[PDB]
Amino acid sequence: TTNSSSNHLEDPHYSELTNLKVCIELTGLHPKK
């Protein structure tokens, strides 16, 4: 793939905090090959 998109530009709203965001540390899952 190289082009698809599905979301861009939104009315003035939302915020930085409180927006349900995830963060999966890849430091745990690091199986050799």
């Binding site: 599905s6 349900l20 965001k21 995830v22 540390e25 430091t27 199986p31």
Partner: protein
């Protein structure tokens, strides 16, 4: 505009910190790779849930809809 929905993802989103199964997590991370909507940085997969539609929420829920070592 459905607090119920967001309030629904609030569980996984949080519990996601308790989940460490390198199997399930690594398998889910492969999903967001298809929708094409995330940001790679350092060594953590950062992506927003409210950014994706519902059709994806019911999908990512797949792993959460049936655990038990898959």
């Amino acid at each position: 505009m459905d607090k119920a929905y967001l309030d629904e993802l609030v569980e996984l989103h949080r519990r996601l910190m308790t989940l460490r199964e390198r199997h399930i997590l690594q398998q889910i991370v492969n999903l967001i790779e298809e929708t094409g909507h995330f940001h790679i940085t350092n060594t953590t997969f950062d992506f927003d849930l409210c950014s994706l539609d519902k059709t994806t929420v019911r999908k990512l829920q797949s792993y959460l809809e049936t655990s038990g070592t898959s």
